[PDB]
């Protein structure tokens, strides 16, 4: 069950799989030749001892084996590179699916966290696929072969005591656990004392007023004395362990080395044998813990793998957006409409409205954000849970999500910017038309970007790594230029009367209206200052609509009932 | 030399000198004995080796020296215990004066920092005194003696190559540095890629509106391909270093072991000499990093010492207060009051006020540099600098703060239940009389204390762990009970009345005012339903009282500009 989804998504980066069949095999010989490296080492060492100034043939074969082992270690670069290619392909597919995935996923699952999950969970899978698989294979092969060559290397002479040495060292483990437990006790008491002081200290005011200094100091003294009387036991245990570990670690070593010297070395063990023995020890003890590291990394990477496959299993926007082409220029009306994050838990309910072409329209409702979902519905972002959008025969579903979107267009208010790419930032949402110079006509039709025409002279200047350093007016001018360059004129603007103290807004108001005059557009606002200009208003409630009429009757009934009271709170 | 300032606070508690001398003498004994241990190990090993029936005397001497070394390592407990004692003394003195410090220390130096210093700067001094001093001494002694006995035990032959091997590690080290640098490059590129696409993604709204996600995928592709093309260089350089470092290590080990083999095979170096050699090798290689850790920990801890000695300065607050006793039931005046943290940094300008002996008095005005600081200045938390508090011939400025606080009571809006049982919470300010079963006798009339006065346990209630077992609004009743038990005289209450909706405030106010029927009180009462019972008011304009008079006509005169509308707004 573990490896099935893992391979199911790894196979997506298919074409390099055969390469693995090389590298893994190139790994295996790397291990197997490794298994024989100490042996030749022996044949080299005793080669000097038995035959001083040894012959050329054994030297040549030793050299060719060494270069073979080194070149195989280099060829492990092939494994690492294949892993890197797999990771890059996986992450590229992940990014593609994430970008073209429904925005519906984003607002509910902490996109500022999935952003880091991509990189972290890809790095863990990288670590699984690059060195941990080879690590486990080489570890099992190394331990088995090393133990076998050890058996061959002595008639059950020093391996038995060698293996018994950890059996004797088992005595060390309970004392280490006792150390860990009492150290945790010290940490807990330190935390308790720190918490006691942190709690009792800001009350210095009260305790001083009460003139109860002595009781305060007594509580502190009790705490500190408790800490001291626990640290004393810490010291006792440490003093007892010190010799009890150092002596055993020295005794095991002296026992093994003395038994090797006196007995075995007298009759059987050559120096070239002992060097290969040490090499085998250093080659067996080193990779052994790597199997446990492999197991835990494999578990974690399997979890990351489930996360990734969950991410990829969510694609729907592609076939949805590739639909009938349109030409827009039709008034927009909503019949009974409902919406919610869940099919039966609804944020919007039983709402309907009408918006004639050319007439500017605005939306006002509760400050909690109820109007937001309706706005997103008007610009056809979330598919309506229930209801229909009035058009000619209401075909709103069959239209492409690029086409209708690009004819209707979009602009925003609440500080979207990009850093040091001003002209390309203008060209950001453009259809593929480079428009090298003619965009100047847009730059002058902005009616406010003219004031900032010095920046087009630099044409690229950077204001900050995150872009926000350019003031809100600059971004508003850039946005209105974008809107001009997108379509002749169709617009919706967000959060018009929710910030900027109405001042800079008005400074760019002069820029926008004279360009959007006599054109269908929708505006989101919380205050009446700009919406009462010439605009048809829609009064919204908690997931409900009641306001109908253009300005005056809607005011005199609902504003007199609701909107006047709330807008009087925003006078200051 | 900084050691004299360090010992100046170290010697502030001084029972440790004799135990220090004993412990360090035992420590140097441990060092010398451990230095001579490997010779005894050699003698024991050789006696087991050269003779099959090693005499009981040699083994007995080995055992007795082993027991001596173990017992001396045990005696290092004396050093550790002495260190714990000196730490406890240091921390106890630090607390004893810290709790005595003026409030002006705490309102400027924060609460959490101080306690963090108390724990961490003490722990580092413990690490300095307990282990690291002995560590450095034993390290230098061990390295010198081990090198000497390496010179003498074996000829220069083995030692020269043994030391040249680290000189051969000059081949290893720069490539490790190259690894570290390129790995840091990989980390930086990962951070850059994460930051770029983290900036990109939340604009999903705008880009999907612009349906230009193709450019987005292009940017993602460029970034991801850059990361891949740097990771490939990472992998290449890693695969180059691997075999090189492995080969150098194998060569060093094979060279040293082979040379030893010819030595044994040829003659000076005996097996016991070899085990002594190995033991010395480990014994010298352990503390070489320990001395560096000593140096860095000492460098860190000197700053701790400076912080500690900085703490041990300002004991004046509760030392200057042992002056004079008084009855203190007289009306009070304030003259020429213009105060602040520093003469340059003024928080108040020249003001004067009068408060009577039997009626209610409150202070009202803006928060910023207003009511609050004058309230603290009246409660003697901040010492007088240029103004006078008149209780006669300015006697309060010369009277004891103990007496003044004995004749005063303090209750607060925050009302935090201090740690401990409700018994000590109620009798906190009056430890001088035990009041076993008469604490409650004067608390019944409290119209809101009765809500908890039926408590069956009636004493077992405590803070728990954060003070939530009884409500903060209930802690108001506990505090008023404390006040009625303690103070038969003048009282102050702190209350940001434009907070907590005041719904329960009257529910407790109805009690506190009634039980203070004839006691002078000063309160923060800027809200409407609290100035009503305030009688005389003190109106702050900006760090200044611009009017002194009775409740109603005073707000009538002061609301000609601001008070009326502001207070009608506050009640919302
Ligand atoms: C037998 C060969 N193996 C060892 C021999 C050792 O001898 C040591 C002698 C010393 N001089 C005598 C005072 C001191 C100061 C520390 C020693 C340490 C040591 C150093 C730092 C931290 C812990 C220890 C440690 O584990 O020591 C055990 C008490 C040590 C460690 C090992 C592995
Ligand atoms: C083919 C299986 N995979 C490996 C096999 C390895 O074999 C090694 C043998 C050695 N001697 C025998 C001649 C030495 C000295 C280092 C070795 C390293 C090694 C090299 C540099 C840094 C750390 C290590 C390392 O693994 O040490 C971890 C403690 C090593 C590393 C890997 C991945």
Numbering used by the authors:
A (entry chain A), B (entry chain B): 10 to 581
Quote the passages of the study that discuss this structure, keeping the authors' original sentences.
Type IV ABC transporters involved in MultiDrug Resistance (MDR) phenotype perform their function by undergoing a series of conformational changes pertaining to the alternating access mechanism. Binding of ATP-Mg2+ to the NBDs bring them together, translating this conformational change to the TMDs which then open towards the outside (Outward-Facing, OF) where substrates are released.
Here again, electron density denotes multiple positions adopted by the molecule (also observed in MD simulations below), in line with the ability of BmrA to recognize structurally-unrelated ligands. Surprisingly, the rearrangement does not occur within a half-transporter, as it overlays well with BmrA in absence of R6G, but in the relative orientation of the two halves (right part of the structure on which the overlay is performed). The first NBD rotation centered on V363 is conserved in E504AR6G, while the rotation centered on E453 is reduced by more than half. Notably, the oscillation that bring the NBDs closer together is greatly affected as the E504AR6G structure is stiffened and movements are very reduced (less than 1 Å).
